[PDB]
């Protein structure tokens, strides 16, 4: 589809931080973009609103989307427990890339990461499906609440999310 734009309003311990909006490349990975779009609108009656980024590693990425377990073990797609790696056409080209976290081939669920650096070593292992459109400075501010091991000094949540266009 003509590329959807989704927003996340980030909060830190309840205090608002701001909005990051994403362009989803539904023109190259339609199935993967669509799973992330619908979890952002919560239209299948489940999704990202209220979940947290449970692992933030400065200089690398911010990981979230585990709305089931909040720690890396849960989450699910709108297509069921997991779905296949649609394609590896897009690469991890620099800060702002949005890509799917997984537990090996074809295990995509709901977990994702926002790259705060170019992560070329993940190319061909993780499906890139979007990029930050506005609010990269909100993402760089979220990096500061993480650590080498990804534990966060505060609870970073997606207080509200939806589609813009």
């Amino acid at each position: 589809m003509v590329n959807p734009t989704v927003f996340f309003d980030i909060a830190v311990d309840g205090e608002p931080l701001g909005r990051v909006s994403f362009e989803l490349f539904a023109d190259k990975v339609p199935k993967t973009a669509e799973n992330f779009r619908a979890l952002s609108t919560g239209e299948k009656g489940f999704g990202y609103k209220g979940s947290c980024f449970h692992r933030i590693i400065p200089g690398f990425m911010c990981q979230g989307g585990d709305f089931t377990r909040h720690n890396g073990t849960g989450g699910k797609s709108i297509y069921g427990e997991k779905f296949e790696d649609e394609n590896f056409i897009l690469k991890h080209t620099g800060p702002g890339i949005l890509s799917m976290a997984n537990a090996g081939p074809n295990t995509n669920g709901s977990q994702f990461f926002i790259c705060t650096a170019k992560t070329e070593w993940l190319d061909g292992k993780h499906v890139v499906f979007g990029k930050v459109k506005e609010g990269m400075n909100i993402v760089e501010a979220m990096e500061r609440f993480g650590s080498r091991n990804g534990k966060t000094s505060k609870k970073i949540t997606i207080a509200d999310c939806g589609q813009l266009e």
Binding site: R55, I57, F60, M61, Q63, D66, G72, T73, G75, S99, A101, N102, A103, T107, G109, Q111, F113, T119, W121, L122, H126, G150
Partner: peptide, 11 residues
């Protein structure tokens, strides 16, 4: 190392 997995986090 630097990976993004869901379940067994490696180094």
């Amino acid at each position: 190392x630097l990976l993004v997995t869901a379940x067994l986090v490696l180094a």
